[PDB]
Each structure stands twice: as C-alpha cells, then as structure tokens.
Amino acid sequence: MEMDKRMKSLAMTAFFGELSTLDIMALIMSIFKRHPNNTIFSVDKDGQFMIDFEYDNYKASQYLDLTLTPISGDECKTHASSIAEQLASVDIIKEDISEYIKTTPRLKRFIKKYRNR
C-alpha cells in the first residue's frame, strides 16, 4: 500500500517540474514493470489538460503533488486536440517502453539517478 518514496523524491527534487503525468506512468512501467489500472482525463489549476493514471491506491499525478479535477463534458471539446496527442503518446509508450526510455533523455537520466547505491 505504497507510492515508492525514492521515485517521489526524485520527481520533486532532481527533476522538479521536468516530469509530466505520462512521464511518471512510463517510469513506473519501466522501473516497476507495473501498469495503470485505468485512465482519467483531467485538468490542472491553470486548465492544462492531462491524462492521469490510477494504480492500486494512488494516481500518477500524486508523484508530482498535483491537484487535478476530472474533466467536464463541456471541456472535452476544448481539449480534443490535447486528448489526441496524449492518447497517442500512451500508445507509443505502451508499444515499446524500453525504446521510449532510451529515446527520451529526461527519462533515461531519471532511470540512471534512480539506480544509485
């Protein structure tokens, strides 16, 4: 019944602000080989759209100390564009995680910094 302390720390310190909600979803997959139970279309304080990812008892947005409200039907038209981008990314991620990491510098770094004795 836990969010990994090390990851949370890295996301909030060494990578503060660099990581998106999809990023976290990716890292979790890559590092813990664990997948979301489901998806949550959502939006933040400033109204930026973002897919969130629900696990056992925590959301990916929580590794980033983020406060997201679910999306309203009315908003769904406003964000159609972003919704597509992100849905795309998720597929690319789901398709070859290993490749996605190698290809995305921020994520490669994070995996490195994550593996320190």
Curated annotation (Swiss-Prot):
Induction (record text): Expressed in the late phase of the viral replicative cycle.
The protein's name: Late protein OPG112
Keyword vocabulary terms for this entry: Host cytoplasm, Host membrane, Late protein, Membrane, Transmembrane, Transmembrane helix
Cellular component annotations (GO), alphabetically ordered: host cell cytoplasm; host cell membrane; membrane
Domain of life: Viruses
Bilayer disposition of the protein: Single-pass membrane protein
Localisation: Host membrane; Host cytoplasm
Family: Belongs to the orthopoxvirus OPG112 family.
Gene name of the encoded protein: OPG112
Protein's job: Contributes to the formation of crescents and immature virions (IV). Interacts with phosphatidylinositol-3-phosphate (PI3P) and phosphatidylinositol-4-phosphate (PI4P) lipids in order to form virion membranes. Mechanistically, mediates proper formation of OPG125-hexamers, and hence the honey comb lattice and spherical immature virus.
UniProt lineage: Viruses, Varidnaviria, Bamfordvirae, Nucleocytoviricota, Pokkesviricetes
Entry keyword Membrane: yes
The organism of origin for this protein: Vaccinia virus (strain Western Reserve)
Residue intervals passing through the bilayer: 10-32
Location, primary (coarse class): host cell
